[PDB]
Design a protein around this ligand. Structure first.
Ligand code: O1M
Length: 171
């Protein structure tokens, strides 16, 4: 059976309990934690590409008021559907399965200023999603997995001082 498991799920859960936040900048910012997954049940002999995108979680924005995240207004029009291709792509099933697959170099931005960056709307909530694409497939089979533990609000600056502190503590 194809199985895609989140690595360091207990680290992500320490951020999610505070409500996780990721900085977006003009030039783009790497994530912490990094999204890493373990993969089993690919065909070791087949070639696959791994893609990452971010799904908008809500029909509204968020705001941090009196130490709580609350609904903050109507949303901005959806960010364009940016996809990040894992740099090891395309590669053998055996490659993807022999060690966790790390998205350590993806950058999150709030300006379409290119460079394979992912544009997000500040004060909107997003859920990472990985796609596995089989190479040379006339059916163009894709598999998609979501990672609820990794939901976060995109911000231009940390709102929750407990998140600022945790980002330093574990990084
Ligand atoms: N005390 C805990 O149980 N946490 C904190 C550390 N955390 C972790 C995992 C990988 C890593 F690189 C850094 C930190 C795992 C969950």
């Amino acid at each position: 059976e194809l199985r895609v498991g989140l690595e360091e799920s207990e680290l992500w859960l320490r951020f999610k309990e505070l409500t996780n936040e990721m900085i977006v900048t003009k030039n783009g910012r790497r994530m912490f934690p990094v999204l890493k997954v373990n993969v089993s049940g690919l065909d070791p002999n087949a070639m696959y590409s791994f893609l990452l995108d971010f799904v908008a979680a809500d029909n509204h924005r968020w705001k941090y008021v009196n130490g709580e995240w609350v609904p903050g207004g109507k949303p901005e029009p959806q960010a364009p559907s940016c996809v990040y291709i894992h740099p090891d792509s395309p590669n053998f099933g055996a490659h993807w399965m022999k060690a966790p697959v790390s998205f350590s170099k993806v950058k999150l931005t709030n300006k379409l200023n290119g460079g394979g960056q992912i544009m997000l709307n500040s004060l909107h909530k997003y859920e990472p999603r990985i796609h596995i694409v089989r190479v040379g497939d006339p059916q163009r089979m894709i598999t998609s997995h979501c990672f609820p533990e990794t939901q976060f609000i995109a911000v231009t600056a940390y709102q929750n001082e407990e998140i600022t502190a945790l980002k330093i503590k574990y990084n």
